[PDB]
Design an enzyme around this catalytic site. Structure first.
Site, mmCIF file in Angstrom:
data_model
loop_
_atom_site.group_PDB
_atom_site.id
_atom_site.type_symbol
_atom_site.label_atom_id
_atom_site.label_comp_id
_atom_site.label_asym_id
_atom_site.label_seq_id
_atom_site.Cartn_x
_atom_site.Cartn_y
_atom_site.Cartn_z
ATOM 1 N N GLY A 10 49.494 18.294 63.340
ATOM 2 C CA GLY A 10 50.330 18.952 63.986
ATOM 3 C C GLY A 10 50.632 20.632 63.504
ATOM 4 C CB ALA A 11 50.502 21.884 59.849
ATOM 5 C CG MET A 13 44.107 25.803 57.588
ATOM 6 S SD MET A 13 43.052 24.415 57.398
ATOM 7 C CE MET A 13 42.366 25.022 55.565
ATOM 8 N N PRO A 14 45.827 28.986 58.535
ATOM 9 C CG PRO A 14 47.100 30.435 57.205
ATOM 10 C CD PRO A 14 46.753 28.778 57.509
ATOM 11 N N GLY A 17 41.324 32.237 54.347
ATOM 12 C CA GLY A 17 42.008 32.123 52.961
ATOM 13 C C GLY A 17 41.139 32.538 51.588
ATOM 14 C CG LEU A 18 41.774 34.611 47.435
ATOM 15 C CD1 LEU A 18 40.926 35.818 47.506
ATOM 16 C CD2 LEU A 18 43.028 34.989 46.593
ATOM 17 N N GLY A 19 39.560 32.267 48.238
ATOM 18 C CA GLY A 19 38.808 31.233 47.368
ATOM 19 C C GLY A 19 39.210 31.794 45.924
ATOM 20 C CE1 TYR A 49 36.485 24.655 42.280
ATOM 21 C CE2 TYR A 49 38.353 25.823 43.410
ATOM 22 C CZ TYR A 49 37.153 25.011 43.410
ATOM 23 O OH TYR A 49 36.606 24.655 44.735
ATOM 24 C CE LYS A 78 38.596 22.682 47.321
ATOM 25 N NZ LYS A 78 38.912 23.780 46.334
HETATM 26 N N1 LIG Z 1 35.182 22.365 47.919
HETATM 27 C C1 LIG Z 1 33.990 22.595 47.153
HETATM 28 O O1 LIG Z 1 33.431 21.813 46.772
HETATM 29 C C2 LIG Z 1 33.778 24.053 46.833
HETATM 30 C C3 LIG Z 1 32.509 24.522 46.363
HETATM 31 C C4 LIG Z 1 32.452 25.747 45.961
HETATM 32 C C5 LIG Z 1 33.518 26.746 46.554
HETATM 33 N N2 LIG Z 1 34.606 26.215 47.116
HETATM 34 C C6 LIG Z 1 35.618 27.274 47.463
HETATM 35 O O2 LIG Z 1 35.190 28.177 48.305
HETATM 36 C C7 LIG Z 1 35.332 29.498 47.571
HETATM 37 C C8 LIG Z 1 34.414 30.678 47.903
HETATM 38 O O3 LIG Z 1 33.135 30.099 47.379
HETATM 39 P P1 LIG Z 1 32.345 30.640 46.061
HETATM 40 O O4 LIG Z 1 33.351 31.217 45.302
HETATM 41 O O5 LIG Z 1 31.432 29.819 45.842
HETATM 42 O O6 LIG Z 1 31.506 32.129 46.771
HETATM 43 P P2 LIG Z 1 31.922 33.303 47.608
HETATM 44 O O7 LIG Z 1 33.100 33.139 48.237
HETATM 45 O O8 LIG Z 1 30.595 33.003 48.760
HETATM 46 O O9 LIG Z 1 31.352 34.486 46.885
HETATM 47 C C9 LIG Z 1 32.105 34.894 45.852
HETATM 48 C C10 LIG Z 1 31.265 36.034 45.049
HETATM 49 O O10 LIG Z 1 31.100 37.112 45.962
HETATM 50 C C11 LIG Z 1 31.674 38.339 45.648
HETATM 51 N N3 LIG Z 1 32.427 39.170 46.797
HETATM 52 C C12 LIG Z 1 33.534 38.683 47.125
HETATM 53 N N4 LIG Z 1 33.818 39.691 48.113
HETATM 54 C C13 LIG Z 1 32.549 40.551 48.094
HETATM 55 C C14 LIG Z 1 32.470 41.671 49.145
HETATM 56 N N5 LIG Z 1 33.335 42.062 50.060
HETATM 57 N N6 LIG Z 1 31.267 42.400 48.585
HETATM 58 C C15 LIG Z 1 30.503 42.084 47.682
HETATM 59 N N7 LIG Z 1 30.577 41.099 47.138
HETATM 60 C C16 LIG Z 1 31.786 40.263 47.357
HETATM 61 C C17 LIG Z 1 32.736 38.018 44.232
HETATM 62 O O11 LIG Z 1 32.743 39.005 43.443
HETATM 63 P P3 LIG Z 1 34.297 39.390 42.667
HETATM 64 O O12 LIG Z 1 35.105 38.244 42.529
HETATM 65 O O13 LIG Z 1 33.796 39.783 41.439
HETATM 66 O O14 LIG Z 1 34.760 40.418 43.525
HETATM 67 C C18 LIG Z 1 32.124 36.667 43.848
HETATM 68 O O15 LIG Z 1 30.708 37.175 42.910
HETATM 69 C C19 LIG Z 1 35.585 29.074 46.093
HETATM 70 O O16 LIG Z 1 36.057 30.235 45.443
HETATM 71 C C20 LIG Z 1 36.516 27.850 46.184
HETATM 72 O O17 LIG Z 1 37.547 28.452 46.553
HETATM 73 C C21 LIG Z 1 34.759 25.200 47.303
HETATM 74 O O1 LIG Z 2 32.565 21.950 43.273
HETATM 75 C C1 LIG Z 2 33.434 23.054 43.168
HETATM 76 O O2 LIG Z 2 34.555 23.311 44.143
HETATM 77 C C2 LIG Z 2 32.589 24.194 42.808
HETATM 78 O O3 LIG Z 2 31.685 23.864 42.035
HETATM 79 C C3 LIG Z 2 32.183 23.438 40.679
HETATM 80 C C4 LIG Z 2 33.268 24.146 40.204
HETATM 81 C C5 LIG Z 2 33.720 23.476 38.940
HETATM 82 F F1 LIG Z 2 35.173 23.985 38.449
HETATM 83 C C6 LIG Z 2 32.989 22.710 38.062
HETATM 84 C C7 LIG Z 2 31.993 22.458 38.459
HETATM 85 C C8 LIG Z 2 31.255 22.733 39.760
HETATM 86 C C9 LIG Z 2 30.020 22.128 40.152
HETATM 87 O O4 LIG Z 2 29.094 21.713 39.521
HETATM 88 N N1 LIG Z 2 29.677 21.820 41.538
HETATM 89 C C10 LIG Z 2 28.371 21.296 42.239
HETATM 90 C C11 LIG Z 2 28.604 19.838 42.331
HETATM 91 N N2 LIG Z 2 27.573 19.181 43.077
HETATM 92 C C12 LIG Z 2 28.126 17.888 43.158
HETATM 93 C C13 LIG Z 2 27.408 16.811 43.637
HETATM 94 C C14 LIG Z 2 27.956 15.498 43.631
HETATM 95 C C15 LIG Z 2 29.055 15.098 43.019
HETATM 96 C C16 LIG Z 2 29.960 16.227 42.400
HETATM 97 C C17 LIG Z 2 29.444 17.501 42.278
HETATM 98 S S1 LIG Z 2 30.058 19.189 41.876
#
Ligand SMILES: NC(=O)c1ccc[n+]([C@@H]2O[C@H](COP(=O)([O-])OP(=O)(O)OC[C@H]3O[C@@H](n4cnc5c(N)ncnc54)[C@H](OP(=O)(O)O)[C@@H]3O)[C@@H](O)[C@H]2O)c1
Ligand SMILES: O=C(O)COc1cc(F)ccc1C(=O)NCc1nc2ccccc2s1
Length: 316
Positions: A10-11, A13-14, A17-19, A49, A78
Site C-alpha cells: 500500500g505504500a 516507492m519513488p 533512487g540514489l545507489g 557497503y 538489505k
Molecule cells: N542488490 C544488489 O545485489 C546490488 C548489486 C549491485 C548494485 N546495487 C545497488 O545499485 C546501485 C547502482 O549500481 P552500481 O553502483 O553497481 O553501478 P551504476 O549505478 O550502474 O554505475 C555507477 C558508476 O557510474 C558512474 N556514473 C554515475 N552517473 C554517471 C553519469 N551520469 N555519467 C557517467 N558516469 C556516471 C559512477 O561514477 P561516480 O560515482 O564517480 O560519479 C560510478 O562509477 C549500487 O550503488 C547499489 O546501491 C545492488
Molecule cells: O552485492 C552487492 O550489492 C554489490 O556487490 C558487492 C558489494 C559489496 F559490498 C561486497 C561484495 C559485493 C559482491 O561481490 N557482489 C557480487 C556477489 N555475487 C554473489 C553471488 C551469490 C551470493 C552472494 C553474492 S555477492
C-alpha cells in the site's frame, strides 16, 4: 511518467533512487545531501557497503534542516548473507537503523538468497576459497523478515537476486504472511531480464534495476568486458534525444515500470541522473535497447557458485 510506483503493501516507492555501493565514506554524506537537495527521495543502502553511518549523517541533516519530512523519504537497506540465521535478523536490522539514524526502513531486502556462516567476515571462506554456507533456508529467513514488519521496524520487505524459482518458493511458502514487495535485480541493456521481470510484475512484485549504467567502478572490471556507456548504438539514441548516454540508461528501466537506482558521488552526475522525467524513449527505442541483451552480469561472484542457493544457474 509518475514519480512513484504503488507497492503491494500500500505504500508508494519513488522510481528513481540514489545507489550507494562503492560511494566512499568520505564522499557519500555530501553525495546524499546533494541528491536530496536536487529532488531524490529514495536512497538504496546496504550494511555490506560499509557506509551506512555516513549515508545516515546526510539523511539526518536534511531531516533536521527540514528540507524534507521523513514520510517523504524512501530508505532501503538489505540484510547481509551472514545474518540469515533467525536469531540474528532483528539485530542486523537494528544495526542498520542505528547507522542510518532511522526508526524504521521503508523497505528491507534479503540481499542475496544465500546464507553464509555468521561472524565478522562478510565472505567467510574455507581454506580453498569457497564461501562457507549456513544451514539456513530462504523460507525461515523470510519468516524472520516478516517479524520485522510486525514489530514496526520496517514498512515493507522484499528480496534481491532471487531467481524465479526462488521467488516462487517464497510465494508458495506454507503460512506466508507478507508477499515480497520488491525483487531488486541487475538489469540494463546487456542483461534485459524479460522473463524474470514479467514473472515478478505478474505477481504484483515491483522490480528494481541495479547497476543500470553497467557499474563502471566495479572493482573486478576487466578490459574485455562490454561497456554500456561507450556503446555507439546507445550513444546514438542519446544523441537523438539530446540527452546523455547515462540518462538514456536510466530512462530505459523507468519505461518498463521498474525502479532504478544509479549510483554517483559526483554532484554534476547526481543532478544529471535525476533529469530524466522530461523526455520519452519511443517504443522502437525501447525494443532496440532490449535487443542488446548479452546475458552479461556485473554481479555474480565465483566463490559463491557452489552454494546450494546460488541464484544464477537457473535460466531465470
Ligand atoms: N542488490 C544488489 O545485489 C546490488 C548489486 C549491485 C548494485 N546495487 C545497488 O545499485 C546501485 C547502482 O549500481 P552500481 O553502483 O553497481 O553501478 P551504476 O549505478 O550502474 O554505475 C555507477 C558508476 O557510474 C558512474 N556514473 C554515475 N552517473 C554517471 C553519469 N551520469 N555519467 C557517467 N558516469 C556516471 C559512477 O561514477 P561516480 O560515482 O564517480 O560519479 C560510478 O562509477 C549500487 O550503488 C547499489 O546501491 C545492488
Ligand atoms: O552485492 C552487492 O550489492 C554489490 O556487490 C558487492 C558489494 C559489496 F559490498 C561486497 C561484495 C559485493 C559482491 O561481490 N557482489 C557480487 C556477489 N555475487 C554473489 C553471488 C551469490 C551470493 C552472494 C553474492 S555477492
Amino acid at each position: 511518467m509518475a514519480s512513484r510506483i504503488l507497492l503491494n503493501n500500500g505504500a508508494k516507492m519513488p522510481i528513481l533512487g540514489l545507489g550507494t555501493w562503492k560511494s566512499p565514506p568520505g564522499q557519500v554524506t555530501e553525495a546524499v545531501k546533494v541528491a536530496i537537495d536536487v529532488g531524490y527521495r529514495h536512497i538504496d543502502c546496504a550494511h555490506v557497503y560499509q557506509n551506512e553511518n555516513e549515508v545516515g549523517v546526510a539523511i539526518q541533516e536534511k531531516l533536521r534542516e527540514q528540507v524534507v519530512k521523513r514520510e517523504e523519504l524512501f530508505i532501503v537497506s538489505k540484510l547481509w548473507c551472514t545474518y540469515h540465521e533467525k536469531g540474528l535478523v532483528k539485530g542486523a536490522c537494528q544495526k542498520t537503523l542505528s547507522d542510518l539514524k532511522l526508526d524504521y526502513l521503508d523497505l528491507y531486502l534479503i540481499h542475496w538468497p544465500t546464507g553464509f556462516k555468521p561472524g565478522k567476515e562478510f565472505f567467510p571462506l574455507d581454506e580453498s576459497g569457497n564461501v562457507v554456507p549456513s544451514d539456513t533456508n530462504i523460507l525461515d529467513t523470510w519468516a524472520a523478515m516478516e517479524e520485522l514488519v510486525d514489530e514496526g521496524l520496517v514498512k515493507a520487505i522484499g528480496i534481491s537476486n532471487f531467481n524465479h524459482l526462488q521467488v516462487e518458493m517464497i510465494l508458495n511458502k506454507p503460512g506466508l504472511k507478507y508477499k515480497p514487495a520488491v525483487n531488486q535485480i541487475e538489469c540494463h541493456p546487456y542483461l534485459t531480464q524479460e522473463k524474470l521481470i514479467q514473472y515478478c510484475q505478474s505477481k504484483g512484485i515491483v522490480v528494481t534495476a541495479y547497476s543500470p549504467l553497467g557499474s563502471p567502478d566495479r572493482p573486478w572490471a576487466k578490459p574485455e568486458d562490454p561497456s554500456l556507456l561507450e556503446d555507439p548504438r546507445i550513444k546514438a539514441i542519446a544523441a537523438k534525444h539530446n540527452k546523455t548516454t547515462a540518462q538514456v540508461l536510466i530512462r530505459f528501466p523507468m519505461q518498463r515500470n521498474l525502479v532504478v537506482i544509479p549510483k554517483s558521488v559526483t554532484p554534476e552526475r547526481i543532478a544529471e541522473n535525476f533529469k530524466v522525467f522530461d523526455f520519452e524513449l519511443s517504443s522502437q527505442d525501447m525494443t532496440t535497447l532490449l535487443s542488446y541483451n548479452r546475458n552479461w552480469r556485473v554481479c555474480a561472484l565465483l566463490s559463491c557458485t557452489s552454494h546450494k542457493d546460488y541464484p544464477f544457474h537457473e535460466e531465470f
